[PDB]
Design a protein around this ligand. Structure first.
Ligand SMILES: Nc1nc2c(c(=O)[nH]1)N[C@H]1C(S)=C(S)[C@@H](COP(=O)(O)OP(=O)(O)OC[C@H]3O[C@@H](n4cnc5c(=O)[nH]c(N)nc54)[C@H](O)[C@@H]3O)O[C@H]1N2
Ligand SMILES: Nc1nc2c(c(=O)[nH]1)N[C@H]1C(S)=C(S)[C@@H](COP(=O)(O)OP(=O)(O)OC[C@H]3O[C@@H](n4cnc5c(=O)[nH]c(N)nc54)[C@H](O)[C@@H]3O)O[C@H]1N2
Ligand code: SF4
Ligand SMILES: [Mo]
Length: 720
């Protein structure tokens, strides 16, 4: 029975549910949803079963070191570990320059931890080799928002779910991936049965059971589909000229200035009857989706990896925004283009904090000299300290590691040997005989540890305080509830000490705790369109999150970005009601992106599309949810989804052990025959360690966002 309730944030998905941890003095005994956060006291099963994870004894509790490659990992002193880390890094820089070292973090790191590691590597060591797992996830969405709007992050919030009359949910298994959000959507349609829901996804998931229409298009053909929708919208005069004539600019297929007539001319290449067959769907779906979208009083789009993990990821994102831009379904309650963020802090930590290889904090960019100067000034650095060239993006980083270009790397709160694409190649790279890899990891079963040279024990989740920035621009504090076990220390501290010992000027890592970094980061944001200066620690302790922009302590936060009278970044006296200030002329942009396909399409030899997806019970690599026995009762191990019509003709029965094979590897999996995967598609989950499916997937990335195409590759199947 709890004596105190410590306010936090769920450790899992980007829905970012507020949580209250009940501690019976010393130990966490219960957990309940924070009634004051957006989730209003509700949590899904994974969140509900957080305590068994926090109290698990199967943790990394003391530093470990592997004296030599291929050898046993053994205990080592914290002091001996920090000196080892600092000497190896400093030497590498002294010998080969900053670009020989790198930081590979994640959207699961507290904002404060990502900010510190970013600053160390960029302002301290002078290398921009700072990336993270959000590159495997939200990079395409960032690209989409910056190219369409000139600023990252959604312009709306979760609250828009309550006023939308239409939901266009594409490339998102919302029920299994953002449970609390799916419930809020299902609730909306229950309160108002008139609400229409279109679910576009090659797979028929539980998300489609509340859908008015399920568009099961051929993998990769959604750009054609969405262009077709705009064709219909224009053709049936369902567009909003009063809006686009005043707030939109058009760009042709070659990226040059164009106009409405050019948009119409381009769209002629995407007529419904032609696209319906490209997409392998009934032509009525194109008309229906378009009409529901444009005729509705307020439409909201929501999408996830099915859109982002694509070589055309940034373009697919632009197409979704085009729909809202041509119809004016934006900047009003219930109407917005809402990218769903997968991780708890891919937003606050990596995106907003600029902890990616080409970024600087608060929407600054490495290639921009005024930005580099601005940062050198804020961080008290000597002119020119920040390298002008962006560092390696994730896939390139592990490639550099495999070549010996990157000799020292810190992997923190991610499991790359399990989750990076094209594993066989990645494993070879991580096995470089002369590399020095330091893993900050909470659970010993993470496969990446088999590659680590030094393992450091971190304080897990609420064992320390920190901020998480979820998908709706909401910044929420998680206060420390219990003490870290064994020798576990807060990564914020471990970083500050690693820096000092590595030679970094002490004025740079001038932090005792997370609150100290929050105050500097608060300063670094001041004046920018991210400005969250009003989010003091005290306000964050008392509030269940605040949504930025939040400039002064007396400012309530912002739900409607780009809207006069709502967004503080839009002059009180701006002449127009909307202002897309991320663009020089205040106008958003519609892009006539040509629809292509996957990097590796099916052919004679490998006739099927292979996709990979989430399952509600398991969180990623399962080093955390794998400790909760209840979560293992439905899908204990991996399987391969095969379509009914394909199985029959292929001669495969349900339960059969089948070999899924791509050009990169073959893996045996039990077949799960159903109508989930449309014909010509198979799907594998990645939660099982004994079945590392990323060994099957290709390594191609969107040339702009550099996000890998985990969603599509070519395969062949056979009975084992
Ligand atoms: N239980 C649980 N929840 C999670 C996670 C977890 O590990 N476990 N992860 C969190 C994280 S990091 C993230 S990024 C989110 C992501 O969550 P989602 O992206 O919603 O989950 P996925 O299974 O990857 O869903 C992608 C969907 O894209 C489909 N798809 C495949 N090919 C295409 C295509 O060509 N076009 C389109 N439009 N769709 C396509 C798939 O069939 C699948 O249904 O989930 C979050 N939620
Ligand atoms: N085929 C395929 N591959 C994919 C995807 C896909 O859809 N298909 N999705 C991709 C996407 S969106 C993502 S987000 C990535 C994510 O994939 P990863 O980030 O690699 O997966 P996680 O299991 O979340 O890794 C987090 C690690 O943090 C550890 N950890 C937990 N708490 C702490 C802590 O406090 N400190 C430290 N140091 N470690 C801690 C865990 O034990 C675990 O090893 O996977 C990607 N890979
Ligand atoms: S919906 Fe996401 S943030 Fe909310 S309790 Fe579930 S896993 Fe946690
Ligand atoms: Mo993600």
């Amino acid at each position: 029975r709890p004596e105190k309730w410590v306010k936090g944030v769920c450790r899992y998905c980007g829905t970012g549910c507020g949580v209250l941890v009940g501690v019976k003095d010393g130990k966490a005994v219960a957990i309940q949803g924070n009634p004051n956060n957006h989730n209003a006291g509700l949590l899904c099963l994974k969140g509900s079963l957080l305590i068994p994870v926090l109290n698990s004894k199967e943790r990394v509790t003391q530093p470990l070191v592997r004296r030599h490659k291929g050898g046993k990992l053994e205990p080592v002193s914290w002091d001996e570990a920090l000196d080892l880390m600092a000497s190896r890094f400093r030497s590498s820089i002294d010998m080969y320059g900053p670009n020989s070292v790198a930081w590979y973090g994640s959207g699961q790191c507290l904002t404060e931890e990502s900010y510190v590691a970013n600053k160390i590597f960029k302002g301290g060591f002078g290398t921009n080799n700072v990336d993270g797992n959000p590159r495997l996830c939200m990079a395409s969405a960032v690209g989409g928002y910056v190219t369409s709007f000139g600023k990252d992050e959604p312009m709306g919030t979760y609250a828009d779910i309550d006023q939308a009359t239409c939901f266009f949910i594409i490339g998102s298994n919302t029920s299994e991936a953002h449970p609390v959000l799916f419930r809020r959507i299902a609730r909306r349609k229950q309160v108002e049965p008139g609400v229409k829901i279109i679910v576009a996804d090659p797979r028929r998931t539980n998300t489609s059971r509340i859908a008015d229409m399920h568009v099961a298009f051929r993998p990769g053909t959604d750009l054609a589909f969405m262009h077709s929708m705009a064709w219909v919208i224009i053709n049936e005069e369902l567009d909003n000229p009063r809006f686009w004539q005043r707030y939109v600019n058009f760009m042709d297929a070659e990226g040059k200035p164009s106009d409405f007539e050019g948009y119409k001319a381009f769209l002629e290449n995407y007529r419904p009857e032609k696209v319906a067959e490209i997409c392998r769907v009934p032509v009525e779906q194109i008309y229906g989706a378009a009409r529901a979208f444009a005729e509705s009083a307020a439409t909201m789009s929501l999408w996830c990896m099915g859109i982002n993990q694509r070589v055309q990821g940034v373009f697919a994102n632009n197409l979704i925004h085009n729909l809202h831009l041509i119809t004016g379904q934006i900047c009003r309650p219930g109407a917005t283009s809402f990218s769903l963020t997968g991780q708890p802090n891919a937003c606050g930590g990596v995106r907003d904090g600029g902890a990616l290889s080409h970024l600087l904090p608060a929407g600054r960019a490495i290639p921009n000299a005024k930005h580099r100067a601005e940062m050198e000034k804020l961080w008290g650095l000597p002119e020119g300290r920040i390298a002008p060239e962006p560092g390696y993006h994730t896939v390139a980083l592990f490639e550099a590691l495999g070549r010996g270009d990157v000799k020292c790397m810190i992997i923190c709160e991610t499991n790359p040997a399990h989750t990076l694409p094209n594993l066989n190649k990645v494993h070879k790279a991580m096995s470089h005989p002369e590399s020095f890899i330091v893993c900050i990891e909470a659970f010993p079963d993470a496969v990446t540890l088999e590659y680590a040279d030094l393992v450091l024990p971190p304080a897990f989740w609420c064992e320390r305080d920190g901020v998480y920035g979820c998908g709706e621009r909401r910044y929420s504090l998680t206060e420390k509830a219990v003490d870290p076990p064994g020798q576990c220390r807060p990564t914020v501290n471990t970083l500050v000490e690693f820096a000092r010992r590595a030679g970094v000027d002490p004025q740079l890592v001038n932090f005792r705790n997370a609150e100290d970094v929050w105050n500097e980061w608060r300063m670094v944001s001041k004046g920018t369109t991210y400005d969250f200066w009003g989010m003091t620690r005290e306000r964050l302790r008392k509030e269940s999150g605040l949504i930025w922009p939040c400039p002064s302590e007396d400012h309530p936060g912002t739900s409607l970005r780009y809207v006069r009278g709502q967004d503080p970044c839009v002059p009180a006296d701006h002449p127009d009601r909307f202002f897309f200030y991320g663009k020089p002329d205040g106008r958003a942009v519609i892009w006539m992106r040509p629809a292509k396909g996957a990097a590796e399409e099916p052919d004679a030899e490998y006739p099927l599309y292979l996709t990979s997806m989430r399952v509600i019970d398991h969180w990623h690599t399962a080093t955390m949810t794998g400790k909760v026995p209840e979560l293992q009762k439905a899908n204990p191990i991996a399987f391969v989804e095969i379509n009914e019509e394909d199985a029959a003709r292929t001669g495969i029965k349900h339960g059969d052990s089948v070999i899924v094979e791509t050009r990169r590897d073959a893996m045996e999996l039990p077949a799960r025959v159903s109508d989930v995967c449309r014909p010509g598609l198979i799907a594998v989950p990645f939660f099982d360690p004994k079945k590392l499916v990323n060994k099957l997937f290709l390594d191609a990335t969107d040339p702009v966002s550099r996000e890998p195409e985990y969603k599509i590759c070519a395969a062949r199947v056979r009975k084992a």
